[PDB]
């Protein structure tokens, strides 16, 4: 992984040593080069993972997340450079450095071979994230609750597992895993191993930090939060469930119920959301509830669907935040009903809205549909009755996805808004860089299906 | 909000239109339309205004019983089949300010005249604002009626978005 | 129930501006100023060549040398065989049915 870690580090000297007006040109050009080289990780074998060294490895699960992570950095730079134009040079460079350090932690987090190394990097990602959202945001209980009920119990459980098993290396755990027998102490080990990831997904009932975070965050913060940071919870659960069997058989039930019901609740809430960024944030809770279900029932089909859903959602949700940001940069408001009939004024940007909406409601054969379908098939075997809940969710999702399109793009334009300038080349390029790779992945879906393929 | 007269005349028109929806054929509608007029002409000179209001109230209850469930609607009227059909085609005039100069150069004569209107708008604004100040009682307007231009050379206050509104068939 | 003299006058003044505005939407003679059976058979011939013949060459090449070279990619329903028929591959003759009852 050093071929990716070191060049990512070199983005920092590049940004700080660049000419005053070239900081966006240099960082974007060179982060795209790093993203290009990330395709070399697709050297995946049918039996073995790609094991670089004693610290880092890459299987079919972390590879697509790594490529998504490295693709996002250049996109985040384009999305940010307009609203940071008036910031001074040193604060521009500090913002870019925060994005680079977040990529550095992320690529190591997805490739850490030892779970305690994963945990340390998994928590370091919050330092640049909180700085980004606070220092460049628009305007306590959850930090305290999350650490109390998530981060700290996970640390104790991992340390306890290492004492008992003798290792936390993931390859070693694949061969030395022992069954988890029923006991009250094992019930707390199970919860301690999962609650930190459930909060970050987020699990329904623990999700209200996400709409709040998205409302305050700048565009880059929302992009990485929606595309990659949520998937740390999914990735962590996909790994740590290896050592939680067979206790997951019954411990999953309350969390499956929360997700299956949470799907319909958060989808329904999207119909009544008055703020675009909140609507997308609740849409992410609904989509991620499918990933939680898929991880918990742990079947070969549910894991392939979960991997595709995480990748597909990352591109789609990030694209939707960029679309909502392009409106905000004109009308300076997040309210969905304020600016209507925008298709009359911005015809091409309306096409992006349509394509983003179509992937959001999982139109076949988008990878949004493939991932969603695989989970629906797997949960039907788990219990035939689940098809009703999954089916209803598909209906409501199409309703709010098209409601968002109809409210903002269709109808009559708002008379008094007269600063709707034509879409810049920067914005159109930003949208096509989300949707083109997303639609191209339909041609070769196998590379985002994960290691169970 | 509406006088008694305005309510009697609005019922007369509404009753006739719903009658048209039933009769369909023009000779049949003409016959029953004259009977309906004879009913309105029976109590035209009712003086007792308590009696007149009772007559109107019963008339409106009779209308509700007799109305057509699917009355005729003019195509471009609210609820008609062409209502707002062309709204997607109405682009506000301020969009022309954002045209690329190469787009503007295809219509030199048009965009030259457009400058004259923009000039006329700018030079009239102060006088329009002043006129509304000196005609508006303290506390603000009591109604939404706007005044005309009272001098020569003045334009009626707040004319821009009425005069330059999109055409009803903009393409 | 008519216009007041004030209302009449404002409408007249707006009417004059609106009609002048509408007249100004007419294009001048030079606008837009732009920058610098045989026929019926040619279009059908060119269209047939570019949209039927070229695609069929590509598709036939694709099927003949890439799709039919793999197993079970194009599966035919086997031809119906009726009594009396002759099979090309082997020359076998299929015997006729029995003799029918009179009907």
């Amino acid at each position: 992984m050093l071929k990716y870690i070191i060049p990512t580090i070199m983005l920092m000297p590049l940004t700080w040593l660049s000419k005053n007006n070239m900081i966006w040109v240099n960082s974007t050009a060179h982060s795209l080069l790093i993203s290009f080289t990330s395709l070399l990780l697709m050297n995946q074998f049918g039996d073995n993972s790609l094991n670089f060294s004693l610290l880092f490895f890459s299987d079919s699960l972390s590879t697509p997340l790594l490529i998504l992570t490295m693709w996002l950095l250049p996109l985040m730079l384009m999305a940010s450079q307009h609203h940071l134009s008036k910031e001074n040079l040193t604060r521009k460079k500090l913002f870019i450095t925060m994005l680079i350090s977040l990529q550095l932690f992320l690529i190591m987090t997805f490739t850490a071979m030892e779970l305690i190394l994963f945990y340390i990097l998994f928590e370091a990602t919050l330092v640049p994230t909180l700085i980004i959202i606070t220092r460049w945001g628009n305007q306590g209980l959850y930090f305290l609750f999350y650490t109390l009920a998530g981060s700290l119990p996970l640390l104790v459980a991992l340390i306890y597992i290492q004492n008992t098993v003798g290792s936390l290396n993931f390859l070693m755990l694949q061969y030395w895993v022992q069954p988890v027998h029923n006991s009250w102490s094992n019930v707390f080990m199970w919860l301690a191993c999962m609650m930190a990831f459930m909060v970050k997904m987020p699990l329904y009932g623990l999700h209200l930090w996400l709409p709040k975070a998205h409302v305050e965050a700048p565009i880059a913060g929302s992009m990485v939060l929606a595309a990659v940071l949520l998937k740390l919870g999914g990735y962590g659960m996909l790994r740590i469930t290896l050592i939680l069997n067979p206790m997951t058989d019954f411990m999953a039930y309350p969390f499956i119920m929360l997700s299956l019901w949470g799907m319909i609740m958060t989808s329904s809430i999207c119909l009544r959301q008055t703020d675009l960024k909140s609507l997308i944030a609740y849409s992410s809770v609904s989509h991620m509830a499918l990933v939680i279900v898929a991880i918990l029932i742990q079947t070969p089909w549910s894991y392939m669907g979960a991997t595709a859903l995480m990748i597909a959602h990352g591109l789609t949700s990030s694209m939707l935040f960029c679309l909502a940001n392009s409106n905000y940069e004109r009308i300076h408001s997040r309210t969905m009903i304020l600016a209507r009939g925008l298709q009359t004024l911005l015809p091409l940007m309306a096409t992006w809205w349509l394509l983003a909406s179509l992937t959001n409601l999982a139109l076949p054969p988008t990878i949004n549909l493939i991932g969603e379908l695989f989970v629906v098939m797997s949960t039907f075997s788990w219990s035939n009755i689940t098809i009703i809940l999954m089916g209803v969710n598909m209906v409501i999702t199409a309703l709010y996805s098209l409601y968002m399109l109809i409210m903002t793009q269709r109808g009559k334009y708002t008379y008094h808004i007269n600063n709707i300038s034509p879409s810049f080349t920067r914005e159109n390029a930003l949208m096509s860089l989300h949707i083109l790779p997303l639609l191209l992945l339909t041609l070769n879906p196998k590379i985002i299906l994960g290691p169970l393929y | 909000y509406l006088t008694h007269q305005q309510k009697v005349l609005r019922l007369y028109k509404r009753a006739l239109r719903h009658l048209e929806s039933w009769c369909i054929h023009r000779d049949k509608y003409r016959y029953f339309a004259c009977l309906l007029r004879a009913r309105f002409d029976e109590h035209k000179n009712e003086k007792d205004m308590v009696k007149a209001t009772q007559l109107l109230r019963e008339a409106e209850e009779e209308f509700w019983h007799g109305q057509h469930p699917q009355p005729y609607i003019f195509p471009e009227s609210p609820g008609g089949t062409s209502y707002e059909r062309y709204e997607c085609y109405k682009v506000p005039e301020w969009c022309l300010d954002d045209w690329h100069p190469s787009e503007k150069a295809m219509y030199p004569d048009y965009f030259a005249k457009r400058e004259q209107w923009k000039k006329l708008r700018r030079e009239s604004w102060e006088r329009e604002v002043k006129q509304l100040q000196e005609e508006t009682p303290v506390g603000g307007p009591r109604t939404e009626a706007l005044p005309p231009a009272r001098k020569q050379g003045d334009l009626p206050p707040l004319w821009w978005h009425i005069v330059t509104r999109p055409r009803e068939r903009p393409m | 129930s008519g216009y007041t003299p004030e209302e009449k006058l404002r409408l007249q003044q707006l009417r004059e501006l609106r009609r002048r505005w509408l007249k100004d939407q007419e294009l001048s003679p030079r606008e837009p100023v732009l920058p610098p059976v045989i026929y019926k058979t040619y279009r059908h011939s060119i269209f047939a060549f570019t949209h039927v013949l070229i695609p069929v060459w590509i598709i036939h090449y694709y099927l003949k040398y890439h799709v039919t070279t793999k197993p079970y990619t194009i599966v035919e329903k086997k031809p119906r065989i009726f009594p009396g028929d002759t099979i090309l591959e082997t020359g076998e003759v299929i015997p006729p049915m029995k003799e029918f009852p009179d009907q």
Binding site: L346, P347, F424, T425 | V91, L96, D98, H100, E103 | -
Partner: peptide
């Protein structure tokens, strides 16, 4: 008669 059709800028 030929009338001007008001449209958003298509150049960009």
């Amino acid at each position: 008669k030929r009338l001007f059709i008001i449209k958003p800028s298509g150049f960009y």
